[PDB]
């Protein structure tokens, strides 16, 4: 759930480990055909962003 602000110039952050957890969960559902991540561009680094998408493509190959 949404965290709070530290100051007017200091916003909440997005935790990479939380998105990986959600991906691990959706892997057990049969109905979905498309995978989307609405808060991926706000990850602290580009490296985390790319890592998340490589995992999503690997899931598609396996299923």
């Amino acid at each position: 759930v949404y965290d709070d602000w530290s100051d007017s110039e200091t916003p909440p952050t997005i935790n990479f480990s939380d998105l990986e957890s959600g991906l691990a969960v959706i892997r057990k559902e049969d109905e979905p055909t498309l995978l989307l991540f609405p808060d991926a561009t706000n990850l602290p680094t580009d490296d985390e962003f790319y890592s998340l998408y490589n995992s999503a493509l690997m899931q598609c190959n396996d299923l």
Partner: protein
Amino acid sequence: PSSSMAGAYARVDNDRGVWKSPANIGLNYVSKPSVTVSHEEQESMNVHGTGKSVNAIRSFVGK
């Protein structure tokens, strides 16, 4: 699930015969399995080094 299966065994014997497998049977009065079992997760249930196999109760879309 054991009493539900005894019921299911009786249905198969009457409609198809005792020589047919008691599987690919829908259960009555069941909302859902308590635990979701994925495709990959069942590999060790059907085939295992000890031979002590476990059958699975699973949810199928539209069935």
